[PDB]
Design a binder for these strands. Structure first.
Lengths: 94, 97, 81, 92, 93, 90, 77, 80
DNA sequence: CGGTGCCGAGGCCGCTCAATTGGTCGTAGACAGCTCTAGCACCGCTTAAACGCACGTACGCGCTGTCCCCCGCGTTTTAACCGCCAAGGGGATTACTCCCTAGTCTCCAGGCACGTGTCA
DNA sequence: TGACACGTGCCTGGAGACTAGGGAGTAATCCCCTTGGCGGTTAAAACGCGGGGGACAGCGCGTACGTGCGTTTAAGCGGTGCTAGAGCTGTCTACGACCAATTGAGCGGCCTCGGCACCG
C-alpha cells in the first residue's frame, strides 16, 4: 500500500517467470523501421524477430541490473541516466 | 562395433568427428581427437543435465525447460564462468535482489 | 513507418528494469534506455542484414540474427546455430 | 538431421531417469553442445597451427580442453577423456 | 613481413619521415591481425552460405561487417576500384 | 606482377599466399587477395598518415609505437576497430 | 610510457607463479617483458574505470568497493 | 619463492594509479590491486604454460604469452 | 487440494543413410643427433627507488531539513491479440554446364641483404 | 654515432601458360511462410491526483593521506662463465586421407499416456 512493498513483489513475480516483457507488435514495427533504412523492402522471419526480441530483452535486463549496481553503489535506490551511462562506459560498449 | 561402444560413450564419436572435419578447424584430424572430444562433451552434458534435473526437482516439475537449463548454468560457478556471455532463450534470471 | 521507438512503452521499460532488479526508476530513465535499445538494435540489425545481403536473400532469417549476435559476443542458443 | 537429441535423452535417462526433456530444452542444449564443440575445435586448431602442425590429434584437443576449462571441471573432463582414449586403445 | 611495403606507403604520404624498427614490428603484426580477422569472417560467411570459397563478395561482406559505415564504405570503394582496375587490365590482355 | 596492373602499393601477392597457408577456407578466389590487399593498403595509409601527423605534432619525425597508439586511440572509428589492443612501449 | 613496475620484482613474481603451476620452468626475457606490458595496460585501464566509479559516487579517492564494482561490471570476478 | 607479491610495491601501484588518472588513493587499495594483479597473472600464466606444455617446451616464449593475451581478450602488438 | 482437458513426450516398427570395416599409400610427424643461442647463477658498485615517520589538512562520512518527484490506485482509452482468410513473394530444390580455381613446367625480377656516402 | 638512400649482388616466390575437373551460376519449379486485411474483446497503457519517501545540498567532525626529509636497500649495471635446450637437419615409419563394400543406429510415422494449466 505504502510506497514500496509492491516493487519488491513485482521483482519476485517477474524474476521467477520468463515470459516476454516487450509487446510483440510494437517491437516488430520497431525492428522493421530500423531495418528499413539499411535495406529497403525487407522481410522478417517470425523466428528472427522473436530472436531479436529475446536478445534485446536479455541485454536490457543485464544493463538494468548493472545500473542498479551503480545506483546502489552511489547510496541511492533510484536509477538515473548517469547510472546507465556509467554502466555502459565501464562495460566498454559506449 | 562402432566407436561410441568402444570407448563406452553415450555420445557419437563418428558424428563429432564428422563435425570436426566439416568445420575445417585443421587440414587433418587425428584418430584420438574425436574420441577425446566426445568424452569431454559427454561429461559436460551429463553435468549440465544433472544440475538441471536437480533444479527441476527443486521446482517440482518433471519436464526440463530452458528456464531450468539457465538456472543450472548460472547456479554453478564453473558453468557460469564458461557460459557467462550467453543468453538462453526463455531463460530468465535467477531471483536475487 | 514514421517512429516506433515509442512502441517500447513506459510500463514495458518499467517491467524490464523491475525484472532486472531495480525498485525505483527515475523519470528520465525511459528516454535514455530507449536510445540505448535503439543503438543496440541498429548494431545487431546492420550485421543481420549484411549477412542476408551476402546470402543474396531478401528475408532476414533467425540464423542471420543469431550469427550477428554471436559476432558481437552475445550468443543466443534457443534459435538454432 | 544433425542434432544430439537422442543422446541428450539417453544421458538424462542414465543420470535422472525419472525426468524428461522438452523440445525447447533439446534445441538450446543442442546449440550449447555445438558451440562448446566449435570453441574447443577452434582452440585446438589454433594450438596445432601455432607449432607448425597441420593435424589436430588427441594432444591438441586435450590441451585445448585444459586451456579452455580452468578449474576442477577441467581436470575431471581431462580425466574422463583420457579414460575414454585408454578404453578405446584397449581394443587391441 | 611487409617490411618495405610500409616504407613505400610512407613515401607518398607524409614525405620526409621514416618508420622505426619497433613501429614496423608493430604495424606488420597489426596488418597480420587485421588480415586474419577479415579472412576468418570471410570463411565463416562462406561456410554459412554453404560455399567453400572466398571471393570478392565474401571479403566485401567481411569488411562491411568489421568496419562500420563511416569507414567501411571508403574501404569498400577502394577495394571495388582495385578489383575493377584489375578486371579492365585483364580484359584487353 | 598483379600489383602492377592494380593500383596497389600493398602486395596483391604475399596475401594470397598468406590466405592459402592460413586455411581460412578450402579455396580462395582470384579477386579476394586483391580486394583484401586494397583494403589493407587503405587501412595502412590511414594510420600511417595519423602517426605522421602525431610525429609532426611532437616534432619527432620518426614514427614510434607511441605515435601508433595515439593514432589508433585518437579516432572514434579506429578506436572501435582496435579497442582491446595494447601497443608495446606505447 | 616508460615501464612502471620494476623489472626484477615482476620477474621474480612471474617465476614464482609459474613454478607454482609447472615446476622447473624457464622464461625468455621477451615473455617477461610482454607479461609486464600487458599487466601495466590492464592495471591502468582498471584504475581508469575505478576513477570513473569514484567520480560517480561524489568521491575523488578510490576505495576497494570502487575496484570491486568496476571488476563486477566489467564481468571478471 | 615466498611472499613475492610484495614485489609490486606500494609506490609502483601509486604510479600506476596516477597514470590511470586518479587523484587520491585509499590505503586499502594496495592489497586489493595486488590481489587483482595476482589473479590476472595466474590466468595469463596458466594459459601460457599450457601453450608451452603443448609444444613440449620448457621455456615460455613471447609467442605463447601473446597467444594467451589474445585468447583472454587483450591482443598484444610488438612481440609477434 | 481435487477434477477436467489438452498435447507434446515416449515407445515400436520401417529403413536408409551415415557410420564401420578393410586395404593402399605417401607424406606428416615421431625420433636421434648436433650446434650454438641465450637462459641462469654470481661477482661487486653505485645509486635511484623504496621505506619509515611527522604532519597539516583535504575530504569521506554522518546528520538534518526540504521539496519534489516517483508510486499506488482509479478510470478511460486504445491498441495488442487472437482467430481466420487471401494472396503471392521468395525460401528451398534440382538439372546443365562452364568458367574458375587447384596443380605443374619454367623464368626472372622484385625483394632482401650488404657496402658506402650522408644526415638526423 | 646510428640509420636512410643509392649501387651491388644474390635468390626464391610471383607469375605466365597450360591442363582438368568440379563449384556453383543460372534457369525453371514447388509451395511455405510472410504480409495485409477484417473484427471482437479486453488486457494494458495513458492520464490524473494524493502523498510519502528520498535525492540533494548544507554543515560539522575526525581521520587518513599526500608531501617532505632522512635512512635503507636491492635494481641495474657490466662482466664472467656454465650449460639447458631451441632450433635445425636427417630420415623413416605410422597413420590419416581415400575409396569400395557392408550394415545397423537413429530418424520419422503412428498409437499411448501422464504432466501442465485452469478453475473451483
Amino acid at each position: 500500500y505504502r510506497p514500496g512493498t509492491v516493487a519488491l513483489r513485482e521483482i519476485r513475480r517477474y524474476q521467477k517467470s520468463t515470459e516476454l516483457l516487450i509487446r510483440k507488435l510494437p517491437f516488430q514495427r520497431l525492428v522493421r523501421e530500423i531495418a528499413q533504412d539499411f535495406k529497403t523492402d525487407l522481410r522478417f522471419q517470425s523466428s528472427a524477430v522473436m530472436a531479436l526480441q529475446e536478445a534485446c530483452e536479455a541485454y536490457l535486463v543485464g544493463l538494468f541490473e548493472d545500473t542498479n549496481l551503480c545506483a546502489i553503489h552511489a547510496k541511492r535506490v533510484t536509477i538515473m541516466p548517469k547510472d546507465i551511462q556509467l554502466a555502459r562506459r565501464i562495460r566498454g560498449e559506449r | 562395433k562402432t566407436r561410441s561402444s568402444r570407448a563406452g560413450l553415450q555420445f557419437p564419436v563418428g558424428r563429432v568427428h564428422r563435425l570436426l572435419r566439416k568445420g575445417n578447424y585443421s587440414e587433418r584430424v587425428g584418430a584420438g581427437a574425436p574420441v577425446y572430444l566426445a568424452a569431454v562433451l559427454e561429461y559436460l552434458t551429463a553435468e549440465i543435465l544433472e544440475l538441471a534435473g536437480n533444479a527441476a526437482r527443486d521446482n517440482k516439475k518433471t519436464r526440463i525447460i530452458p528456464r531450468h537449463l539457465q538456472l543450472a548454468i548460472r547456479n554453478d560457478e564453473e558453468l557460469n564462468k564458461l557460459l557467462g556471455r550467453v543468453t538462453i532463450a526463455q531463460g530468465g534470471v535467477l531471483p536475487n535482489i | 513507418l514514421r517512429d516506433n521507438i515509442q512502441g517500447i512503452t513506459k510500463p514495458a521499460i518499467r517491467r524490464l528494469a523491475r525484472r532486472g532488479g531495480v525498485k525505483r526508476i527515475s523519470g528520465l530513465i525511459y528516454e535514455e534506455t530507449r536510445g540505448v535499445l535503439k543503438v543496440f538494435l541498429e548494431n545487431v540489425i546492420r550485421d543481420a542484414v549484411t549477412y542476408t545481403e551476402h546470402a543474396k536473400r531478401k528475408t532476414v532469417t533467425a540464423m542471420d540474427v543469431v550469427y550477428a549476435l554471436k559476432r558481437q559476443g552475445r550468443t543466443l542458443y534457443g534459435f538454432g546455430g | 538431421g544433425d542434432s544430439f537429441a537422442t543422446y541428450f535423452r539417453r544421458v538424462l535417462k542414465q543420470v535422472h531417469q525419472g525426468l524428461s526433456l522438452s523440445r525447447e530444452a533439446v534445441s538450446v542444449m543442442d546449440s550449447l553442445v555445438h558451440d562448446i564443440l566449435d570453441r574447443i575445435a577452434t582452440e585446438a586448431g589454433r594450438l596445432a597451427r601455432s607449432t607448425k602442425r597441420q593435424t589436430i590429434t588427441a594432444w591438441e584437443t586435450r590441451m585445448a580442453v585444459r586451456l579452455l576449462l580452468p578449474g576442477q571441471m577441467g581436470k575431471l573432463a581431462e580425466s574422463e577423456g583420457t579414460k575414454a582414449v585408454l578404453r578405446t586403445s584397449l581394443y587391441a
